[PDB]
Amino acid sequence: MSLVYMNIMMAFTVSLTGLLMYRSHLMSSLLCLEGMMLSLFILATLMILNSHFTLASMMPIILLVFAACEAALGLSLLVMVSNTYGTDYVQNLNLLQC
Amino acid sequence: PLNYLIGGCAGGLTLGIGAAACAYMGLTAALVKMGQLEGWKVFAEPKV
Amino acid sequence: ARQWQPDVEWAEQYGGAVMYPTKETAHWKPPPWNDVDPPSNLTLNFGPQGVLRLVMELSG
Amino acid sequence: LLDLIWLETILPKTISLAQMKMSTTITSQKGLIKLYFLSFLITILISTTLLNFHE
Amino acid sequence: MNPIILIIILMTVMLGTIIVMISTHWLLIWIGFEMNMLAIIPIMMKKHNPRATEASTKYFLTQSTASMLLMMAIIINLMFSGQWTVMKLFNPMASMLMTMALAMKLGMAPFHFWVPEVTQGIPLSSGLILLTWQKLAPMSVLYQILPSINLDLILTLSILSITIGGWGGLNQTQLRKIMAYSSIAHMGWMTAVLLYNPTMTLLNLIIYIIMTSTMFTLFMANSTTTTLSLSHTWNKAPIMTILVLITLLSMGGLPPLSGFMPKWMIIQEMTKNDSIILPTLMAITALLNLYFYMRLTYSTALTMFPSTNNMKMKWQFPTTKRMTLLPTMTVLSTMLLPLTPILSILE
Amino acid sequence: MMTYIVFILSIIFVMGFVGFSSKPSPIYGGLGLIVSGGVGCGIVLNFGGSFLGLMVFLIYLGGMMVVFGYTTAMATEQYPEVWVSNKVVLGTFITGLLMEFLMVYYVLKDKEVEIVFKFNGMGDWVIYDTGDSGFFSEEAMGIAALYSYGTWLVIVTGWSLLIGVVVIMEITRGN
Amino acid sequence: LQYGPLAYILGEKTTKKMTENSKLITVDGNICSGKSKLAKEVAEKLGLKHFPEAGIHYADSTTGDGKPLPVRFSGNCSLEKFYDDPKSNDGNSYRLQAWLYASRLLQYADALEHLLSTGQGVVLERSIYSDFVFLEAMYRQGFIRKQCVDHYNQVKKVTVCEYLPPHVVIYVDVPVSEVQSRIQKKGNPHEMKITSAYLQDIENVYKGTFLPEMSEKCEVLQYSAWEAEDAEKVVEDIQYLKYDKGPWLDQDDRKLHNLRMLVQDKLEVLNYTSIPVFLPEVTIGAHQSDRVFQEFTELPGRKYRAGYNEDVGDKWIWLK
Amino acid sequence: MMTGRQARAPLQFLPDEARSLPPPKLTDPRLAYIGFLGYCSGLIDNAIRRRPVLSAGLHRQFLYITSFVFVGYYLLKRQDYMYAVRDHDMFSYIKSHPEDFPEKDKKTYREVFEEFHPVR
Amino acid sequence: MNLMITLLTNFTLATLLVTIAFWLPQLNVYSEKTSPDPMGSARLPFSMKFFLVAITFLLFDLEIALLLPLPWASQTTNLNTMLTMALLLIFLLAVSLAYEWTQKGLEWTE
Amino acid sequence: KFYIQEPPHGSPNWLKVGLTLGTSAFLWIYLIKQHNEDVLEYKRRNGLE
Ligand SMILES: CCCCCCCCCCCCCCCCCC(=O)OC[C@H](COP(=O)(O)OCCN)OC(=O)CCCCCCCCCCCCCCCCC
Ligand SMILES: Nc1ncnc2c1ncn2[C@@H]1O[C@H](COP(=O)(O)O)[C@@H](O)[C@H]1O
């Protein structure tokens, strides 16, 4: 397919691979997840402006707002983890092995 | 079918446990041979 | 003689964290019964930076 | 010999031995979220490139 | 939790699933999944202990990844089709992404690695919601996009889900993880028959929700979370003893019980379409589910009985718990098989 | 050179995610995501999406990544780094960022022009100014139609934001 | 139930009945400290509902006809046999102690349920917070084993964390000499077999372990053998306290609604007392449990739910 | 399968054309079996709350039976409607494509040759 | 184009003033000094209140993001629907504020 | 009396019993009316009179 869309998809898959190989922190997971959301915003915006499809121009803002609210929820979860262990480490989140 | 039964038991002797893997891989390769003969579909297309 | 109802050794081998204790599963202790797990405040030194030093046990 | 051992070995017990070994190689997960998403990416890199399920 | 806030949040969960069910637009599908997740996160944290925060964190990560993959599938559909109707997808790349994302939202294998954890971390009513109500929206989207779902991918996910939900039930004493692996196996069963007859998908879904709701209602009536804690039911409430176990004999898939109703019908739709090997293998794995769950049945109705002395005090107090629809759901999860041709109402 | 500018930004955008998908730290991860948000906003603004680019700055970057840096700065206990006199404390920064722009200019090489020149977009890609629109940004009026046409969308969005407030205040209580 | 979440919606808020007299006061002391009169005296000065000390047959007194049941249905343990042989073979020591912990847990649940359903305070005698002080004093005498202390700490860890501490802990200082004087003057032939060092270890775990950890979570009031005789000085100490510690201060209608829904469900209160931790003093086999349960079902009024027994004169059953 | 039929008139539990079909009788064995399920739910409800199972709550058992019969009557009407739609669409598609459904020439066994396999 | 030149000139002047501010007193050979505040070696305790006001900013900022196209939405033909949805969004922002009020969310930073 | 505490089901809840019998009788009479209207509609559409 097209070229700049392939670049935005490449960024989406790169932040996906960063979202699928955890190093140390939960904040790194939330950052890779919101980089994915950013690339979804960029690619949706370029499609909607390309076709001159007018009513969908409110769609990326919608795609922003919900997902930003989603990120807020994720941040609050991280905080409660960091109120139990002192760190946001993903290896402290292993009590559900049994 | 019998030749791939021999081939499955040959793959089972280099697997180990020995006779069980012999019989299992022999019966599995037998089912592969019989699927190639009678046209048995594992991921069958939805037709009706 | 009447009808076999267990020994306690039969009941204890259906417990723990795992059914079959293997090598990697032997140290897994079972979770707590009510599913809750057993889990300070800030202390500042307003130094001389009249003059007075203030040790503050603050709580937020 | 034949019933109390051999036919007791092949039908009820070596098959159950196979299932308990397969489950202890499955149900031995450490609970690490890193390894769980690493296995998810193993799935993605097997299916999207090799297995060709997007075609 | 404030009960008015609980009612508002539960109606928001129901509203998010309804918005996924009624919408002709992909943005509203995504909005309904976001609303459903956002509202179900406090249901898991009803008790405020670290296992619920860990469970909610794992659930947030998996469902958020699935939501972003769903939006990427929607965006690629808008590339190759320029439109937004919830219908078949116009790229097999977007089809593969939406199938993977809905398998993540259902917890189908190999994206099953969050289902026995989160169900372990949360209470029994929230696990009931997670294993009954949260299946309804991605199965609805799979119902609406089946002209684009790849056959080989959905069959691979189906049989892998049935095998892993089978071999997950061996090593477990926790009732909630056993319900989670039973969930994974039954989602493999539902998505096995999806591209052949989705009426049997809805039949399997309804029978699964009835059996799962009966089992979680019995677990809430007895307040038992493990096998060993379930083993004291015979001395406390003896009528509670067998109903769990005839419901679990149903959940294995066993005649004449109504849990034999889905799987047989699924086989009845796959031997029509000339697949003989695949339902044979899947229902042999269902017999492996019978193997482990029948071992649990032997655990409760038989050998490992013995009581403790404080149980004598529980004899002087009845259950004041709300066992809501539990006789109705116990009758509907066993004796429904002579009404098997009722399934035509699900067309 | 100037024609391919959106494409150039997209390349930088991809490289920006390699800044933080390799995850050196959550703080440098936030920094790389801010730079990536700015260059993806440049991509958006160069198709005439002015309001959407300012929503990237005002709501994604200045609204949400502020909160990500704020929550990150309330975690991940810090430690000092190299603090020698100016031949280290700023000279290494300038040589490192010059090597970063060297890496940006370094990828535009013979393996790139086989994709650029065979699939030349600039010349025929950016077609947002195809004819006249009138006295109005079409993107502005499409966002304006959220209130007349988007009644159900605004209802479910405002309900999700109210439920977001309620959900955050319930899970962040501990009681 | 009668009280539920719908009653909380319709306006039955349990801080509306929380007055300054709504205080849960636990009187603590040694075996014959003579506090049993004092608590009753507080019940006729502060206007509080006195709950007596939970014996073997507390749950028998709360349910059914209110009479004590035979010992095979309730307890399967005797206080007097612990007085005779504390180092017995069959393990009456930890079995009697665990049944007393469950009975005091039902007493404390009834105490909080009365306090939250009426707004009238409750005077308790030796609540669940002061029960381990016997157990430890038993384990210091070798009367039980270490595994019994582990089982009790498991049950306490999963049960006492759900509740609030009392408002006032009234402790009585009576040394071992006057305790033995009152035991020998009491006239119980079994109770006089209590050794000296057992009472000493009760008083030691009182003074060194119980009261210092109760000092942070509530306010204690400590009395000797003779100044606890006057009720008016005790009531003047109670009323002129300034309640400033403890988790009672951050209790709104939501937390107290959760606590009141918790304590009215008696099977959820008594849930974790019978955890499946197999200890030989409390483990009953299947045949004995079956036989005792089937003998329990044929007791008058115990065959069905309480409004449904024709043998004790329940009418209108076919419309209930 | 038949979702294109219920797509021009959505969310109709019983369409108007379903009124052209005979309703189930009130002595339907399926409906009496659903009433038996109501009686079983009443007995289980009186059992799990430790009530005298046959005696207590006769109004409650009567409402269990009545509610199951009431829902089951409409479920049987919808079942009969859906199988009637199935046969109606089948017969219309058979009538509208005779070239895909030829009349097979039925041969008597005096022409049909079967290989005899002797059993001995 | 002019905007990119202006941003580049502002960035160049900023980096030039920072570079002058660092390299001009490092001409001096003043002194290499040694021996390295209200805490000496204390860790940072987390505060829940600062995170609550950050998430409150983010949620009301999303509600403002919805409210932003109102000067354009005033020009529409369906003014009754537009007025109802504008008042509904500002009312939901006010309901979020009242729920932040009554559940003690605005306390000790009120 | 026999009980030391009053049970929640010592007396029949007459509002609940009355609503139960009234709702059940309403479902019976509405079911009979629906079946009579359906057989009348069947005989009117298919001419079996
Ligand atoms: C084509 C078909 C389309 C779809 C058809 C319909 C699908 C319905 C799916 C239903 C899923 C229900 C999930 C559970 C209900 C949701 C709310 C909830 O959890 O209520 C339970 C409630 C919570 O009370 P709480 O105080 O939290 O208890 C925990 C201990 N304190 O109270 C309790 O915990 C009390 C214990 C009993 C709860 C029983 C709830 C059963 C609900 C499901 C009934 C069966 C399914 C519906 C009928 C068949 C249709 C599939
Ligand atoms: N370990 C114990 N030994 C003896 N009595 C105990 C023990 N724990 C609690 N008690 C109770 O304490 C009572 C003594 O208090 P009193 O009623 O004042 O004599 C006894 O009658 C028992 O019911």
Q: Are D31 and A97 in contact (CB under 8 A)?
A: yes
- Tokens 């109770």, residue located: G191
Helices E175-192/E260-270 angle, 10° precision: 30
| Most C CBs within 10 Å, among G163, G268, G278, G281, to test the C interface | G278
From the list H6, H45, H78, the residue facing E327 with the nearest CB is: H45
Distance separating alpha carbons of residues G314 and G302, to the nearest angstrom: 12
I102: CB partners within 8 A, 6+ apart: none
Sort E65 into a burial class: Cβ within 10 Å, 0-12 / 13-18 / 19+. Answer: buried
Q: In testing the pocket of ligand 2, which one of G31, G74, G135, G172 has its CB within 8 Å of the most ligand atoms? A: G31
Sort D5 into a burial class: Cβ within 10 Å, 0-12 / 13-18 / 19+. Answer: exposed
Question: Is C60 in CB contact (< 8 Å) with chain E?
Answer: no
According to DSSP, the residues that pair with G217 across neighbouring strands are none
Closest residue by CA, ligand 1 atom 6: E206
Question: Is C21 in CB contact (< 8 Å) with chain I?
Answer: no
Closest of G270, I16, G122, I2 to residue E312, by C-alpha? G270
Q: Are E52 and E45 in contact (CB under 8 A)?
A: yes
Q: Are G110 and G299 in contact (CB under 8 A)?
A: no
From the list F64, F148, F172, the residue facing I81 with the nearest CB is: F148
F168: CB partners within 8 A, 6+ apart: A72, A73, A76, I52, I55, I59
Q: Is the CB of E220 under 6 A from ligand 1?
A: yes
Q: In testing the pocket of ligand 1, which one of E6, E18, E124, E128 has its CB within 8 Å of the most ligand atoms? A: E128
Q: Are A65 and A80 in contact (CB under 8 A)?
A: no
Q: What Rg value do the Cα atoms of chain C yield, rounded?
A: 28
Distance separating alpha carbons of residues I60 and I52, to the nearest angstrom: 12
Distance separating alpha carbons of residues F175 and F168, to the nearest angstrom: 13
Distance separating alpha carbons of residues E157 and E163, to the nearest angstrom: 10
From the list G272, G283, G287, the residue facing C5 with the nearest CB is: G287
Q: Are E129 and E137 in contact (CB under 8 A)?
A: no
E226 φ/ψ angles, rounded to the nearest 5 degrees? -120, 170
Distance separating alpha carbons of residues F68 and A30, to the nearest angstrom: 9
Pick the CATH number of F4-172 from 2.60.40.1190, 2.70.98.90, 3.40.50.300, 1.20.120.1200: 1.20.120.1200
Q: Are E46 and E58 in contact (CB under 8 A)?
A: no
* β-pairing verdict for E307-308 and C54-58: unpaired
Name the token pair of F74: 């309330």
Q: Is the CB of G138 under 6 A from ligand 2?
A: yes
Q: If DSSP states are collapsed to H, E and C, what string results for chain C? A: CCCCCCCHHHHHCCCCCECCCCCCCCCCCCCCCCCCCCCCCEEEEECCCCCCCEEEEECC
Interface touch E120/A84, C-beta < 8 Å? no
For chain G, positions 273-302, list CB contacts with chain E under 8 A. 273-276, 278-279, 282-286, 289-290, 292-293, 296, 302
Interface touch G316/J12, C-beta < 8 Å? yes
* H or E, element range at C57: strand C54-58
In chain I, where the domains are located: 1-110
A1: CB partners within 8 A, 6+ apart: E79
End-to-end, the C-alpha distance of chain I in Å comes to 45
In chain F, where the domains are located: 4-172
Distances (CA, A) of G278 to C12, E237, G285: 8, 20, 11
Q: How far is CA H76 from the centre of its chain?
A: 6
G150: CB partners within 8 A, 6+ apart: none
Q: How many E×G Cβ pairs under 8 Å?
A: 108
Q: Is the CB of G36 under 6 A from ligand 2?
A: yes
Closest of F56, F60, F34 to residue F47, by C-alpha? F56
Sort I28 into a burial class: Cβ within 10 Å, 0-12 / 13-18 / 19+. Answer: exposed
Name the token pair of A55: 């009513």
Q: What share of chain I is helix, strand, coil (3-state, %, to 5)?
A: 65, 0, 35
Closest residue by CA, ligand 1 atom 5: E206
Resolution (A): 3.1
Q: Is G28 helix (H, G, I), strand (E, B) or coil?
A: strand
From the list H40, H64, H79, the residue facing E341 with the nearest CB is: H79
Sort E222 into a burial class: Cβ within 10 Å, 0-12 / 13-18 / 19+. Answer: buried
Distance separating alpha carbons of residues A56 and A70, to the nearest angstrom: 21
Distance separating alpha carbons of residues G282 and G280, to the nearest angstrom: 5
Measured between CA atoms, the residue of chain A closest to residue C24 is: A97
Taken in order I72, I74, I75, I76, is the CA torsion positive or negative?
Answer: positive
H114: CB partners within 8 A, 6+ apart: none
Distance separating alpha carbons of residues E84 and G152, to the nearest angstrom: 63
Chains A and D touch (3+ CB pairs under 8 A): yes
J6: CB partners within 8 A, 6+ apart: none
Interface touch D40/A22, C-beta < 8 Å? no
Closest listed ligand to the CA of G57: 2
| Nearest atom within ligand 1 for CA of residue E324 | 37
In chain E, where the domains are located: 1-347
Q: Is the CB of E131 under 6 A from ligand 1?
A: no
Question: Is A3 in CB contact (< 8 Å) with chain E?
Answer: no
Closest listed ligand to the CA of G136: 2
Interface touch I55/F166, C-beta < 8 Å? no
Distance separating alpha carbons of residues I48 and F173, to the nearest angstrom: 9
Q: Is the CB of E39 under 6 A from ligand 1?
A: no
| Helices within chain G (DSSP H only) | 5-9, 35-43, 58-62, 79-84, 92-118, 132-139, 146-159, 176-186, 196-205, 211-217, 231-239, 253-264, 266-269, 286-297
Q: Residue G151's CB: how many other CB atoms inside 10 A? A: 21
Q: Are E62 and E70 in contact (CB under 8 A)?
A: no
* H or E, element range at G171: strand G168-172
* β-pairing verdict for G49-50 and G168-172: unpaired
Q: Is the CB of G31 under 6 A from ligand 2?
A: yes
Name the token pair of C10: 């039969």
Interface touch E273/B42, C-beta < 8 Å? no
Q: Is B46 helix (H, G, I), strand (E, B) or coil?
A: coil
Distance separating alpha carbons of residues E191 and E193, to the nearest angstrom: 5
Taken in order E85, E87, E91, E97, is the CA torsion positive or negative?
Answer: positive
From the list C40, C44, C60, the residue facing I38 with the nearest CB is: C44
Sort F98 into a burial class: Cβ within 10 Å, 0-12 / 13-18 / 19+. Answer: exposed
Q: How far is CA H81 from the centre of its chain?
A: 9
- Tokens 């989603």, residue located: A70
Distance separating alpha carbons of residues A38 and G38, to the nearest angstrom: 72
DSSP state string for G278-293: --TTTEE-HHHHHHHH
Q: After which residues are there C–N gaps above 2.5 Å in chain F?
A: none
Edge-first strand order for the sheet with G168-172 is G49-50, G122-125, G24-28, G168-172, G219-223
Half-sphere exposure of G201 (CA within 13 A, CB side): 17
Interface touch A76/I66, C-beta < 8 Å? no
G163: CB partners within 8 A, 6+ apart: G108, G112, G128, G259
The 8-class DSSP code of residue G250 comes to T
Distances (CA, A) of A11 to A19, A47, F6, G132: 12, 16, 15, 62
Distance separating alpha carbons of residues I30 and E194, to the nearest angstrom: 79
Name the token pair of E53: 């925060």
Q: Which amino acid is at G86?
A: P
Q: Is G163 helix (H, G, I), strand (E, B) or coil?
A: coil
Q: Is C54 helix (H, G, I), strand (E, B) or coil?
A: strand
I46: CB partners within 8 A, 6+ apart: A79, A82, A83, F74, F75
G217 torsion bin: left (phi>0), alpha (psi -120 to 50), beta (else) = alpha
Closest listed ligand to the CA of E204: 1
- Domains of chain A (ranges; CATH) run 1-86 (1.10.287.3510)
Question: Using a CB-CB distance cutoff of 8 angstroms, which residues of chain J are in contact with residue H60?
Answer: 20
According to DSSP, the residues that pair with G27 across neighbouring strands are G125, G170
Taken in order I19, I25, I27, I30, is the CA torsion positive or negative?
Answer: negative
- Tokens 């029509």, residue located: E272
For residue H116, report the distance from its CA to the centre of ligand 2, in Å. 95
Question: Using a CB-CB distance cutoff of 8 angstroms, which residues of chain J are in contact with residue G313?
Answer: 2
Q: Are G35 and G27 in contact (CB under 8 A)?
A: yes
| Helices within chain C (DSSP H only) | 8-12
Measured between CA atoms, the residue of chain J closest to residue H51 is: J9
**How was this entry determined?**
cryo-EM
Q: Is the CB of G111 under 6 A from ligand 2?
A: no
Q: Are B46 and E196 in contact (CB under 8 A)?
A: yes
